[PDB]
Amino acid sequence: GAMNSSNYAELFNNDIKLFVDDTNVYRVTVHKTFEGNVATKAINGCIFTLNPKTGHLFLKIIHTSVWAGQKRLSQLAKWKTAEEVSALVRSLPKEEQPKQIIVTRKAMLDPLEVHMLDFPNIAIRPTELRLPFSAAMSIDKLSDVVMKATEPQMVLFNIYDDWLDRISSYTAFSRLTLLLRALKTNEESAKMILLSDPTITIKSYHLWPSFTDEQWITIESQMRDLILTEYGRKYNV
Amino acid sequence: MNTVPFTSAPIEVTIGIDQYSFNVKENQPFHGIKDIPIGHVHVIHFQHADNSSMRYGYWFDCRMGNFYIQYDPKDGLYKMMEERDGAKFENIVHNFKERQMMVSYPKIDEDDTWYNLTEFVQMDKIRKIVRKDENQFSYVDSSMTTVQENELSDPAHSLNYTVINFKSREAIRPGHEMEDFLDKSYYLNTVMLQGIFKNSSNYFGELQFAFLNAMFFGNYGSSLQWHAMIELICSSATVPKHMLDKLDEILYYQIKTLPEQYSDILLNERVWNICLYSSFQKNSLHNTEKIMENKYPELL
Numbered sequence A: 001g002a003m004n005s006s007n008y009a010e011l012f013n014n015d016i017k018l019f020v021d022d023t024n025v026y027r028v029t030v031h032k033t034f035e036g037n038v039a040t041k042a043i044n045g046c047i048f049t050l051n052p053k054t055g056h057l058f059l060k061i062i063h064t065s066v067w068a069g070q071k072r073l074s075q076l077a078k079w080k081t082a083e084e085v086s087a088l089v090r091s092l093p094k095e096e097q098p099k100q101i102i103v104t105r106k107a108m109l110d111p112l113e114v115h116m117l118d119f120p121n122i123a124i125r126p127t128e129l130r131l132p133f134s135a136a137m138s139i140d141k142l143s144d145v146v147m148k149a150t151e152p153q154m155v156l157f158n159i160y161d162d163w164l165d166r167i168s169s170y171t172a173f174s175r176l177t178l179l180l181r182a183l184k185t186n187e188e189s190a191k192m193i194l195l196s197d198p199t200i201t202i203k204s205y206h207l208w209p210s211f212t213d214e215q216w217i218t219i220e221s222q223m224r225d226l227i228l229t230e231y232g233r234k235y236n237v
Numbered sequence B: 001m002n003t004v005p006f007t008s009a010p011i012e013v014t015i016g017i018d019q020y021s022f023n024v025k026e027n028q029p030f031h032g033i034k035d036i037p038i039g040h041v042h043v044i045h046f047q048h049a050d051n052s053s054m055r056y057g058y059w060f061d062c063r064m065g066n067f068y069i070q071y072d073p074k075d076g077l078y079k080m081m082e083e084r085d086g087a088k089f090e091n092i093v094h095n096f097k098e099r100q101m102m103v104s105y106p107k108i109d110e111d112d113t114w115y116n117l118t119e120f121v122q123m124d125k126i127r128k129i130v131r132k133d134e135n136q137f138s139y140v141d142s143s144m145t146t147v148q149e150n151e152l153s154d155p156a157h158s159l160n161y162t163v164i165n166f167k168s169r170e171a172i173r174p175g176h177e178m179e180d181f182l183d184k185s186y187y188l189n190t191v192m193l194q195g196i197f198k199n200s201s202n203y204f205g206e207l208q209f210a211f212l213n214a215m216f217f218g219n220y221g222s223s224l225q226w227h228a229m230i231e232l233i234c235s236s237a238t239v240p241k242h243m244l245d246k247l248d249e250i251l252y253y254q255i256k257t258l259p260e261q262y263s264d265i266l267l268n269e270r271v272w273n274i275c276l277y278s279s280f281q282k283n284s285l286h287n288t289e290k291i292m293e294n295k296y297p298e299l300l
């Protein structure tokens, strides 16, 4: 059924599973027209499909041409997400196909279930976790590839860099969710924390600074301070 | 007019005949029901006074044979049987009629209710839903499960309604997933009407029989089928105009007949609100919407 804090270790077992987050598929800017009406302009988006055990991220870039001449785009976006996840599963060898797909938003359940009718043994599940995957576009190298895209494209990443050489999946997912929550809560301050020391750089083949185990502890502390600081500013605490 | 005699009535029982009902006392001199209108299917149904568990009954058409009821003290129920000796049967009925030991089917002349509830219901189609080929009549009860219910356990005693499942490969063309899920026209018109049912009359017959079994026996699976067949039409953007107009009539008479006090158990809020206010056909069911709003406004 639903995935929550009670069955959290299930994320890191040896049954292949993917999270699917659709919050950045259909993205728009809102503006006034010459006549003083309001119009939207779509910008490129992405599906965030992540294996939480291995860090493998299947970033499907959604180019604005897929919306051309279509109606009810917020509805279509869920169905396009499900179509693309279905296509990804079919593209994978049998022994790499997931046994469970966890959607971050419950409105994805019916579209995905319908697109996956050919796979009756893949469980489609919601979650009660509030996951910060909408902040994926705050990771510079992901935002860059999405914005530069001129056509539909799939790009593969490891969202954990080489962190699994020294820590467990459980801890890597915890670090990722803390980093993304901080970027969602105060993007400018979070990026300042990550780039404040010019001597620590991001490898060409990585998404995040090559921090040591001790520096990651400091960074994680600073991220928690940021989140708490923002909570106090918000609620006047 | 035809007659279903009773050998006797050894146990106190409420007897239904179509939408009518009457109480019979233990060992009362009751010997059956006369003046049954030819031309329609009928249902004779029972609920025992000492055990309201298991409502049960029999669908029959007097044009297909001479049928009577006899209590079986071993199996503890009133059983329908066919009498093949015609002269014996006429002799039995005549004596019971002369002694006025029968109730008369209490049809008012102005009243088309039973025709309106059974317009598309055929005995031959009932006998395919309820499989017991050695009899010409069909037993149904409150507990019988449907083929669909079983899939999700004795198949000889099941209700073989046509399986309708909105999230199934039968309902969704590969490549048309969003289209077919949001607009069920291809499932209704190509799969169900052209493919399985062959025509709208057979589709409405099954819908009508499902409602009747839900109402007369409290058969849950039948209620599920009735709502599924309504929702399939209402969730289709392309439906022939004659089907929409006939559906409005069918449902109007069903809502009209439903006991006011069973609305809480026989009507699905989600389905009815979707069908009347959100669906493609939200404005095509004017008579049904009007009776629903005036009789069961709480459900909406």
Ligand SMILES: O=C(O)c1ccoc1CN1CCOCC1
Binding pocket: A162, A210, A211, A212, A213, A214
């Ligand atoms: O690599 C080591 O020996 C080490 C020792 C403590 O933390 C690390 C982290 N490594 C890999 C990540 O980039 C920094 C260097």
